[PDB]
């Protein structure tokens, strides 16, 4: 069994998603379709927003599995604004190692760029430290 250990840092590049504010940014991570899902805080009228949030998912399949970052933008209504997602496979991600780096988002119809993320990843066997090389 391992876990899928994601920090969520910061974002860049985002575009304005409120006509007279900038966005209010968080992000949401998905393991395949399950219905668990991780979000972020938050940040409030920033495009460089920075959370620093640290995720632990159990995973199913290391090499079969996929990650899915949505980034959304909170509106003051009942939904919030999608603004971009990526999908990552995890089996490129050698086992233990801790991997930092961004990565470009691809932004919903009507959004004109997608903005990028950065993700600290680290696929370790359960019991292990989270983001430490194993
Ligand atoms: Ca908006
Ligand atoms: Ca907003």
Request: net charge positive.
């Given at each position: 069994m391992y876990q899928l250990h994601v920090r969520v840092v910061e974002a860049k590049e985002?575009?304005?998603?409120?006509t007279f504010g900038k966005c209010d940014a968080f992000a949401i991570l998905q393991l395949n379709?399950?219905?668990?899902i991780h979000r972020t805080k938050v940040i409030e009228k920033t495009y460089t927003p920075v959370w620093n949030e640290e995720f632990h998912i159990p995973l199913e399949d290391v090499t079969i599995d996929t990650l899915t970052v949505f980034l959304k933008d909170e509106d003051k209504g009942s939904s919030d604004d999608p603004i971009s997602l990526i999908k990552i496979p995890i089996n490129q991600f050698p086992l233990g190692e801790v991997v930092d780096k961004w990565y470009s988002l691809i932004p919903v119809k009507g959004v004109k760029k997608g903005g990028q993320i950065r993700l600290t990843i680290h696929i370790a066997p359960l019991g292990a430290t989270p983001f430490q090389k194993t």
């Open positions: 985002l575009p304005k998603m409120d379709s399950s219905r668990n």
